[PDB]
Design a protein around this ligand. Structure first.
Ligand SMILES: Nc1ncnc2c1ncn2[C@@H]1O[C@H](COP(=O)(O)OP(=O)(O)O)[C@@H](O)[C@H]1O
Ligand SMILES: Nc1ncnc2c1ncn2[C@@H]1O[C@H](COP(=O)(O)OP(=O)(O)O)[C@@H](O)[C@H]1O
Ligand SMILES: CCCCCNC(=O)CCNC(=O)[C@H](O)C(C)(C)COP(=O)(O)O
Ligand SMILES: CCCCCNC(=O)CCNC(=O)[C@H](O)C(C)(C)COP(=O)(O)O
Lengths: 266, 266
């Protein structure tokens, strides 16, 4: 078997390839020792690593590994997934929403990094925890899905009260900007968590559509494990991309783009 | 006298012109009815209005008043203030960090809005409240200046463990992404507030830098009352502007750009 691993700041994504069939697995970066132990017990023909904690795995295993830069690895693997899933895009932005957010322009031949921002999965977990005291990712994200943001976020139309606004009134004008106007509301964990996901999705999308405009592409492909178990995040992003005149794409197994690409770069 | 008013989502900015001298006053948008009463008791030659709550004032005043779109008003007043303060910039991005944030490219001729984001002053206040229970703006911002974000924010160097990172290791990788590693004790109000101001600052600046690259200018001017009593925010924005090879500017009374511009446009 051939193994590709993208060892990031929160998750270790593992791709196993045998007989032209891929198997996908994830482990927490906190349990990196278990991944090492498991690798030391495998019969492996090729081991390709990428991401922040590639170095740590390679240092601790008893077998040789190849390490690749995650930006190129993610690009290569995403290219493979797009074609497998019926997309023939000439060029695109891709936004890698991992522990944090890295933005890339793929021109049809190669990628260049065009942007980044700390609003990502790590903020969702960290700021979610501060507002809710929930540490378990699945519970945290589930709790957000039917939150109501209306008592928390201020829209353009709330500022332009009795005045035609110069931009769409339904737009979020200020994340959390309605809180001081609703101090009698119960700021429930669901409502608060929905607002967290909202600010993260809005910021990621705003950066992505801005670089899409800059680099003259309408296509924006969103990857990263931050979209797992978070339909609300997918909706916030997808809705606002379309409203900004761009075409959003999600790919099955997109969070494994780096792990797949690591194997192909080798 | 002549009066320019920028009636925003949080503050009403009032400029009075008389005997070649201008006077600045601020009131809370909460208390707009007092502003209207005051206006109706003054002897005003010309009244010029802008901002989301211009309509409210305009409806309840007993004299004519001209109304202007705040993007043009803000651009005009900013240009006046810049020139008054010995800045002759051929072109610039300006970022209006009000209750929310609006981004503009001023090419020399005029302004165009090139983006916006709900990360601004309303977020600082509302998320600040959710994390500290503090409603007093002065108290809230004062508390934040003594905060440390080291225990809350994750840097690139934390993700690339014992390994040379692909982008500068000191950059914030994930805002609040360090929280889950520091759960043994409670997080202090000053640290949480510093982190809130940190993420608002970084988002605003990252967006400003990106559109500055897009529209081929190295100058970024920042205005808005969000900078009032908030040295931390001024600093976060300045440092990252310079880091990305751009030139940050702030003007004295920049929060009054819109009010001053309304006067000039009439
Ligand atoms: N099972 C999970 N446990 C923890 N976080 C998860 C899980 N599934 C998805 N996530 C989300 O995905 C983010 C990590 O995204 P990912 O692209 O895997 O980043 P990295 O390469 O930095 O680990 C987390 O911050 C979190 O928001
Ligand atoms: N005295 C104050 N009261 C409330 N907010 C203040 C005060 N002084 C400064 N601010 C900050 O300025 C922000 C509003 O900035 P401003 O440019 O006046 O926006 P707007 O035109 O929408 O009122 C507030 O969200 C807050 O962060
Ligand atoms: C001082 C302002 C900081 C804003 C700029 N910050 C950045 O560009 C880093 C944003 N984060 C990222 O690009 C990713 O988190 C990166 C460091 C590539 C690690 O990938 P991942 O493990 O997927 O989070
Ligand atoms: C659904 C995603 C929303 C993100 C994009 N949102 C925006 O561009 C609106 C950001 N806010 C603003 O531009 C300002 O708050 C505006 C509505 C012009 C009012 O100015 P101000 O009174 O200074 O806040």
């Amino acid at each position: 078997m051939k193994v590709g691993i993208d060892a990031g700041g929160t998750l270790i994504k593992i791709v196993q390839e045998q007989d032209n069939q891929r198997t996908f697995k994830t482990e927490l970066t906190k349990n990196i020792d278990q991944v090492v132990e498991w690798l030391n017990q495998q019969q492996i023909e090729k081991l390709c690593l990428t991401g922040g904690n590639a170095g740590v795995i390679a240092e601790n295993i008893n077998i040789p590994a190849q390490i690749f830069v995650e930006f190129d690895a993610a690009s290569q693997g995403l290219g493979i997934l797009l074609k497998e899933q019926g997309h023939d895009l000439a060029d695109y932005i891709f936004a890698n929403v991992g522990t944090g957010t890295s933005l890339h322009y793929f021109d049809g031949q190669s990628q260049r990094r065009v942007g980044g921002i700390g609003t990502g999965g790590g903020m969702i977990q960290g700021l979610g925890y501060l507002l809710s005291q929930i540490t378990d990712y699945k519970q945290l994200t589930d709790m957000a899905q039917h939150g109501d943001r209306n008592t928390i976020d201020l829209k353009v139309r709330h500022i332009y009260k009795d005045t035609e606004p110069p931009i769409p009134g339904d737009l979020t004008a200020a994340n959390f900007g309605h809180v001081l106007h609703h101090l009698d509301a119960d700021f429930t964990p669901s409502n608060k968590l929905a607002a967290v996901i909202g600010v993260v999705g809005e910021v990621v999308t705003t950066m992505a559509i801005t670089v899409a405009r800059e680099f003259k592409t309408e296509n924006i492909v969103y990857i990263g494990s931050s979209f797992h178990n978070n339909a609300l995040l997918r909706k916030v992003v997808e809705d606002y991309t379309v409203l900004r005149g761009c075409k959003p794409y999600y790919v099955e197994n997109g969070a494994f783009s780096g792990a797949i690409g690591a194997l192909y770069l080798e």
